[PDB]
Protein backbone atom coordinates (compact mmCIF):
# COMPACT_ATOMS: atom_id res chain seq x y z
CA UNK A 1 0.00 0.00 0.00
CA UNK A 2 1.01 3.61 -0.71
CA UNK A 3 0.80 3.84 3.09
CA UNK A 4 3.50 1.19 3.34
CA UNK A 5 5.73 3.17 0.94
CA UNK A 6 5.33 6.11 3.25
CA UNK A 7 6.09 3.99 6.32
CA UNK A 8 9.42 3.14 4.73
CA UNK A 9 10.03 6.72 3.53
CA UNK A 10 9.35 7.94 7.03
CA UNK A 11 11.78 5.37 8.42
CA UNK A 12 14.55 6.53 6.10
CA UNK A 13 14.08 10.17 6.93
CA UNK A 14 14.35 9.33 10.61
CA UNK A 15 17.47 7.29 9.95
CA UNK A 16 18.92 10.04 7.75
CA UNK A 17 18.36 12.38 10.73
CA UNK A 18 20.21 10.07 13.09
CA UNK A 19 23.02 9.87 10.60
CA UNK A 20 23.07 13.69 10.45
CA UNK A 21 23.36 14.03 14.23
CA UNK A 22 25.83 11.15 14.40
CA UNK A 23 27.95 12.75 11.65
CA UNK A 24 27.92 16.18 13.29
CA UNK A 25 28.96 14.73 16.67
CA UNK A 26 31.99 13.03 15.08
CA UNK A 27 32.86 16.40 13.62
CA UNK A 28 33.19 17.64 17.20
CA UNK A 29 35.19 14.52 18.14
CA UNK A 30 37.53 15.28 15.26
CA UNK A 31 38.02 18.88 16.47
CA UNK A 32 38.66 17.87 20.07
CA UNK A 33 41.09 15.26 18.72
CA UNK A 34 42.74 17.55 16.14
CA UNK A 35 43.24 20.19 18.87
CA UNK A 36 44.30 17.95 21.76
CA UNK A 37 47.67 18.10 23.56
CA UNK A 38 49.40 15.72 25.94
CA UNK A 39 52.29 17.60 27.57
CA UNK A 40 50.23 19.74 29.93
CA UNK A 41 50.23 22.81 27.68
CA UNK A 42 47.20 24.21 25.91
CA UNK A 43 47.08 27.03 23.40
CA UNK A 44 43.45 28.00 22.82
CA UNK A 45 42.50 30.03 19.77
CA UNK A 46 39.40 32.19 20.08
CA UNK A 47 38.01 33.61 16.84
CA UNK A 48 35.33 36.29 16.48
CA UNK A 49 36.30 38.20 19.59
CA UNK A 50 34.09 41.23 18.79
CA UNK A 51 31.03 39.03 18.26
CA UNK A 52 31.67 36.73 21.24
CA UNK A 53 32.25 39.72 23.52
CA UNK A 54 28.90 41.17 22.44
CA UNK A 55 27.24 37.83 23.04
CA UNK A 56 28.79 37.85 26.53
CA UNK A 57 27.38 41.29 27.33
CA UNK A 58 23.91 40.58 26.01
CA UNK A 59 24.08 37.37 28.01
CA UNK A 60 23.63 34.92 25.13
CA UNK A 61 26.90 33.21 26.10
CA UNK A 62 28.70 34.18 29.30
CA UNK A 63 31.69 31.83 28.85
CA UNK A 64 33.50 29.58 26.36
CA UNK A 65 35.45 26.49 27.42
CA UNK A 66 38.38 25.13 25.42
CA UNK A 67 39.07 21.66 24.09
CA UNK A 68 40.56 19.27 26.64
CA UNK A 69 44.34 18.98 27.01
CA UNK A 70 46.23 16.44 29.14
CA UNK A 71 49.22 16.25 31.48
CA UNK A 72 50.05 13.01 29.69
CA UNK A 73 48.67 10.34 27.37
CA UNK A 74 46.94 8.88 30.44
CA UNK A 75 46.80 11.58 33.07
CA UNK A 76 44.56 14.39 34.28
CA UNK A 77 42.05 15.75 31.76
CA UNK A 78 41.73 19.53 31.90
CA UNK A 79 40.54 22.54 29.93
CA UNK A 80 40.05 26.30 30.17
CA UNK A 81 36.98 28.47 30.69
CA UNK A 82 36.86 32.17 29.80
CA UNK A 83 34.35 34.98 30.32
CA UNK A 84 34.98 37.58 27.62
CA UNK A 85 33.05 40.04 29.73
CA UNK A 86 34.04 38.91 33.19
CA UNK A 87 32.88 36.88 36.12
CA UNK A 88 32.88 37.58 39.85
CA UNK A 89 34.99 40.61 40.72
CA UNK A 90 35.54 41.20 37.01
CA UNK A 91 32.04 41.16 35.50
CA UNK A 92 31.89 44.15 33.17
CA UNK A 93 35.42 45.34 33.90
CA UNK A 94 37.69 42.37 33.21
CA UNK A 95 38.13 39.15 31.26
CA UNK A 96 38.16 36.18 33.65
CA UNK A 97 40.36 33.16 32.91
CA UNK A 98 39.68 29.88 34.69
CA UNK A 99 41.27 26.42 34.75
CA UNK A 100 39.00 23.34 34.85
CA UNK A 101 39.61 19.84 36.19
CA UNK A 102 37.58 17.39 34.09
CA UNK A 103 36.64 13.80 34.88
CA UNK A 104 39.24 11.64 33.18
CA UNK A 105 39.14 7.94 32.33
CA UNK A 106 42.18 7.36 34.55
CA UNK A 107 41.34 9.41 37.65
CA UNK A 108 41.35 6.27 39.80
CA UNK A 109 45.12 6.21 39.26
CA UNK A 110 46.02 9.92 39.55
CA UNK A 111 46.77 11.80 42.79
CA UNK A 112 44.10 13.96 44.45
CA UNK A 113 43.44 16.63 45.20
CA UNK A 114 45.03 17.95 42.00
CA UNK A 115 48.15 19.91 42.98
CA UNK A 116 49.99 20.80 39.76
CA UNK A 117 51.10 24.37 39.21
CA UNK A 118 48.93 26.15 36.69
CA UNK A 119 50.02 29.12 34.63
CA UNK A 120 47.24 31.05 32.97
CA UNK A 121 48.04 33.56 30.23
CA UNK A 122 47.02 35.62 27.22
CA UNK A 123 49.41 35.85 24.26
CA UNK A 124 50.56 39.16 22.85
CA UNK A 125 50.27 38.93 19.09
CA UNK A 126 52.32 42.13 18.99
CA UNK A 127 55.97 42.19 18.02
CA UNK A 128 57.33 42.58 21.56
CA UNK A 129 55.48 39.43 22.64
CA UNK A 130 54.50 40.87 26.03
CA UNK A 131 52.37 37.92 27.14
CA UNK A 132 50.04 38.55 30.09
CA UNK A 133 50.06 35.75 32.64
CA UNK A 134 49.52 34.51 36.17
CA UNK A 135 50.47 31.32 38.02
CA UNK A 136 48.57 29.83 40.96
CA UNK A 137 48.99 26.71 43.09
CA UNK A 138 45.83 24.58 43.44
CA UNK A 139 43.94 24.98 46.74
CA UNK A 140 43.93 21.47 48.31
CA UNK A 141 40.78 22.35 50.26
CA UNK A 142 39.07 23.73 47.16
CA UNK A 143 36.39 21.65 45.47
CA UNK A 144 37.84 22.59 42.07
CA UNK A 145 40.88 20.37 42.54
CA UNK A 146 39.39 17.24 44.13
CA UNK A 147 38.63 13.98 42.32
CA UNK A 148 35.85 14.77 39.74
CA UNK A 149 32.22 13.70 40.16
CA UNK A 150 30.57 15.05 37.06
CA UNK A 151 32.07 15.84 33.66
CA UNK A 152 34.07 18.81 35.02
CA UNK A 153 34.56 20.35 38.46
CA UNK A 154 33.89 24.06 39.16
CA UNK A 155 36.35 26.25 37.19
CA UNK A 156 38.95 28.15 39.20
CA UNK A 157 41.52 30.79 38.31
CA UNK A 158 41.65 34.55 37.81
CA UNK A 159 38.32 36.48 37.75
CA UNK A 160 40.37 39.63 37.31
CA UNK A 161 42.93 38.32 34.86
CA UNK A 162 43.01 41.15 32.34
CA UNK A 163 41.31 44.54 32.35
CA UNK A 164 39.03 44.82 29.31
CA UNK A 165 40.56 48.28 28.81
CA UNK A 166 44.09 46.84 28.59
CA UNK A 167 43.19 43.90 26.37
CA UNK A 168 41.21 45.81 23.73
CA UNK A 169 43.65 48.73 23.70
CA UNK A 170 46.74 46.68 22.95
CA UNK A 171 48.08 44.15 20.47
CA UNK A 172 46.60 41.14 22.23
CA UNK A 173 43.80 41.22 19.67
CA UNK A 174 44.75 40.75 16.02
CA UNK A 175 42.55 39.62 13.12
CA UNK A 176 39.60 39.73 15.54
CA UNK A 177 41.08 36.87 17.52
CA UNK A 178 43.07 36.26 20.73
CA UNK A 179 45.04 33.23 21.93
CA UNK A 180 44.91 31.90 25.47
CA UNK A 181 47.58 29.62 26.90
CA UNK A 182 47.63 27.35 29.93
CA UNK A 183 50.59 25.48 31.34
CA UNK A 184 50.26 22.66 33.82
CA UNK A 185 53.42 21.56 35.59
CA UNK A 186 53.79 17.86 34.83
CA UNK A 187 57.11 17.96 36.68
CA UNK A 188 55.95 15.95 39.72
CA UNK A 189 53.46 13.15 38.99
CA UNK A 190 54.28 9.58 37.63
CA UNK A 191 56.88 7.86 35.43
CA UNK A 192 58.70 4.68 36.67
Amino acid sequence: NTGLLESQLSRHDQMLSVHDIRLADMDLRFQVLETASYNGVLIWKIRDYKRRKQEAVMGKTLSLYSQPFYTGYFGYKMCARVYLNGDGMGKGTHLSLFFVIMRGEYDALLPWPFKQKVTLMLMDQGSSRRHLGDAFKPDPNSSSFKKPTGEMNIASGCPVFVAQTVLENGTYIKDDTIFIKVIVDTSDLPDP
Partner: peptide, 18 residues
Amino acid sequence: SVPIQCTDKTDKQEALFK
Protein backbone atom coordinates in the same frame (compact mmCIF):
# COMPACT_ATOMS: atom_id res chain seq x y z
CA SER B 1 49.00 32.25 43.70
CA VAL B 2 45.63 31.09 45.06
CA PRO B 3 42.81 30.14 42.66
CA ILE B 4 39.53 32.00 43.06
CA GLN B 5 36.51 29.80 42.27
CA CYS B 6 34.00 30.93 39.64
CA THR B 7 30.69 32.50 40.63
CA ASP B 8 28.89 31.51 37.41
CA LYS B 9 29.27 27.96 38.76
CA THR B 10 25.48 28.46 38.88
CA ASP B 11 24.40 29.59 35.36
CA LYS B 12 24.64 27.36 32.27
CA GLN B 13 25.36 30.01 29.63
CA GLU B 14 28.31 28.38 27.87
CA ALA B 15 29.38 27.32 24.37
CA LEU B 16 31.75 24.58 23.24
CA PHE B 17 34.86 25.87 21.54
CA LYS B 18 37.70 23.71 20.25
